[PDB]
Amino acid sequence: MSAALPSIQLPVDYNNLFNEITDFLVTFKQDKGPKYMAMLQKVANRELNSVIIDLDDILQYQNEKFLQGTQADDLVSAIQQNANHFTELFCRAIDNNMPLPTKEIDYKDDVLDVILNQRRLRNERMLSDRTTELFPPNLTRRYFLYFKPLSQNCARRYRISSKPLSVRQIKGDFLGQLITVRGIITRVSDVKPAVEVIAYTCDQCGYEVFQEVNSRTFTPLSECTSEECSQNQTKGQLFMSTRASKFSAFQECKIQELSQQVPVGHIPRSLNIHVNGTLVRSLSPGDIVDVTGIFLPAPYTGFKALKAGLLTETYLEAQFVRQHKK
Amino acid sequence: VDDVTGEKVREAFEQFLEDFSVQSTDTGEVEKVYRAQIEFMKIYDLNTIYIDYQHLSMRENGALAMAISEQYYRFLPFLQKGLRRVVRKYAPERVFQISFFNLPTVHRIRDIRSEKIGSLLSISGTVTRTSEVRPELYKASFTCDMCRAIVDNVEQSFKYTEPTFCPNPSCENRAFWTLNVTRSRFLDWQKVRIQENANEIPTGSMPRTLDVILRGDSVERAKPGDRCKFTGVEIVVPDVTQLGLPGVKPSSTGVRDLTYKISFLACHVISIG
């Protein structure tokens, strides 16, 4: 709109940069079949659920069409500015180019395998006897995505995001990039079941409503808004169930300084770190580790007292850890 | 329904104390002792009775006391009205409390379970941390925006609220909780913390407690540290302070969650031991 929330144009565009993601997928020849064929299908065969995309392959794939053939925009320097919008969209390319019925639909290798089929077939049973809302795409993933930086030889050839920065070097302008730090993990908490999507049940009209989940705050719904119950005086009372939703693991820790990068003056500091996904229980206090991952601020929490500097709380998501003293 | 059987326990109890429950003649207890218990309170006016539990169950052979042992809470409207039909045929600023004693069993603290809410039972324990004597409302006179301050009825419960129907002005149910002290009848009560007796319990692991309400004319009869038996009722009190150990507490769909706990009520305390 005009005169309030205006439109600033940017030199970086996002329209064309979906297609070069698709050509970084299974249509790939640098590594019989490519490496992104079988590792996708092995996950589709329910043998793994942690798809670790490397970043060095993005760099070598760029040189295959850099000065050779066509001209294309840079993506590794595009990741090193945003680093978060390339997480939900990099998975958006996967679900189209992935065969689902490759594995058997047999008995329990994981729970919610029979009910998700009943979740999926009832939704087509909802859209059968009518003569158009389906399950949200972030619900049905059943894997994860990660990234690893580059430090050894690829930068020396032709010139980043793998320098072992200390904790005190983290300025305010890195908020939104990929960083790598080091230190001593302390005060580590346990694993607690979080939630990322929520399934209600109206119990009268049957239509299960959902919503999305953001950090530390979410609001429950009102009574049912589905069109079978509503537009009348009789509206169903909806109730949350736990056997119908997706949960995940979650953990927290604090990284101090390594006491060699401390100055002779100021007293050592700490950052908060949330570990989300299948890398849970992979850390232990009192060691020397090298943590990578995206670095984004925590949003507004209520009561409006300490706020308007937002209480940003500067936490740090994790993507890949590299230990020491193996 | 309950109005029907509520009058049946009323008319039986009204017919009970008009008759005698004591058999031994020429050595005391002759000719309707409960009529003789009335006239002694007619001279002294302390507004209580002390009737036996066995002597109720000897006449009808427990045909009545099994309801009074079970649904005790619902019958105190109907037992008070039944007693007040008697004395107005006998005696000419009045309130009355009905105390029982001489129970067969003595229960303990560890046998307290919620299948006996509104029932009658006794308990033995040790008295610790008594408190002060304070008035409680029990009957209000809440006015309205018009000059008619007529408020001698509804909302005498455990909520400190005022009434909704019978409007004095032409308006609807306006603001509430007013207590105009010109006409309101307060009684007195105090709060003590009973603790389980030492020579019953197993290996010492902080034995559990209760908080007991002593209503009426039983105040300052509990000494700090002596054993006692008590009366039957076991109420549950709404509270707000219970947090930190959550369960499934049902909500009220003004939103308010409901947190309940156990509190004991008495009417007659006897200091045995």
């Binding site: 008995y107 329990k108 729970v111 029979v114 009910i115 009943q118 580590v188 346990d190 694993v191 607690k192 079941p193 979080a194 939630v195 989940v213 953001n214 950090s215 530390r216 705050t217 979410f218 009372q237 109730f239 169930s241 736990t242 056997r243 119908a244 949960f247 693991a249 979650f250 232990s284 206090p285 209520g302 | 329904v1 809470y73 560890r110 379970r113 919620s114 299948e115 809410i117 509104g118 509804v154 909704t164 129907f165 197993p202 290996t203 692991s205 109420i235 549950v236 709404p238 947090l243 150990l245 369960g247 499934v248 049902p250 009220s252 939103v255 969650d257 409901l258 309940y260 706990k261 156990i262």
Partner: protein, 285 residues
């Protein structure tokens, strides 16, 4: 077949093999041990239990591993630990009918049939405390080992609710049947033609016991970062006051997660959940 919609359990007139399981089981668990007693355990306990009526069936339950066509309910036991037990509680009331219709009339006609019963099975394998619990196995039977820390007194529960109107008309009750109680708007002997305020008299309505016990497990095989971990339990009426402080207990039960509040006065919820173990059977000291 009218299979339950979200539960995938076979409907009644199919779970009658539990009756046949209850009658024929003599050496099948001793097939592993190579016979190093000739009758069934659960015949003789059934004859002594009807005398007193206080059911509390132990049910060692390493018996659905070795029997003909009972592997499917054993695998539907762990995946659905609530519904199949409550379904079995009907049959544990119904199998006792099968003796009274065959044998002579016992107990001065009947009363023990109107008593409900519970089944408290255990020994579902071996789980590994709290640290190894993944959050994706929500409702499974878990074996837990640890000592007992400080306990709490008895907390009542609304099981039957009750209501009243300001008019002296008929006072009718309602049940909860869910997490939240509901209340109507109108009544019979309606009460000013459906205009009234529903009152809640909370002393005449029935109740149910609940004690929360804070268990401390023993996280052995230490990774040299060690928390004495706290796990809350939610024991119910039959097994209250059976767990003193300072005792190592093997316990079995289901596993839950309940949303919590942020201000405890607003309508917003906290995203992270809290876990507790709703127990079913407590065995040993």
């Amino acid at each position: 077949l009218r299979i339950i919609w979200g539960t995938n359990v076979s409907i009644q007139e199919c779970t009658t093999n539990f009756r046949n399981f209850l009658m024929s089981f003599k050496y099948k668990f001793r097939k592993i041990l190579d016979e190093r007693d000739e009758e069934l355990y659960y015949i003789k306990q059934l004859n002594e239990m009807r005398e007193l009526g206080t059911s509390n069936l132990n049910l060692d339950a390493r018996n659905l591993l070795a029997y003909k066509q009972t592997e499917d309910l054993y695998h539907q036991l762990l995946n659905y630990p609530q519904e199949v037990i409550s379904i079995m509680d009907q049959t544990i009331k119904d199998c006792m009918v099968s003796l009274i219709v065959d044998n002579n009339l016992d107990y001065d006609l009947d009363e023990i049939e109107t008593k409900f019963y519970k089944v408290r099975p255990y020994n579902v394998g071996s789980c590994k405390g709290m640290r190894e619990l993944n959050p994706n196995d929500i409702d499974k039977l878990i074996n837990l080992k640890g000592l007992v820390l400080r306990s709490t007194p008895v907390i009542p529960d609304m099981k039957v609710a009750f209501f009243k109107c300001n008019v002296c008309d008929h006072t009718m009750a309602v049940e909860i049947d869910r997490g939240v109680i509901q209340e109507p708007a109108r009544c019979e002997r309606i009460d000013c033609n459906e205009p009234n305020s529903m009152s809640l008299i909370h002393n005449r309505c029935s109740f149910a016991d609940k004690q929360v016990i804070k268990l401390q497990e023993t996280p052995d095989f230490v990774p040299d970062g060690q928390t004495p971990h706290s796990i809350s339990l939610c024991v119910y009426d039959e097994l209250v006051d059976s767990c003193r402080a300072g005792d190592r207990i093997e316990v079995t039960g289901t596993f839950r997660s309940i949303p919590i509040r942020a201000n405890s006065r607003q309508r917003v919820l906290k995203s992270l959940y809290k876990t507790y173990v709703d127990v079913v059977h407590v065995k040993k000291v």
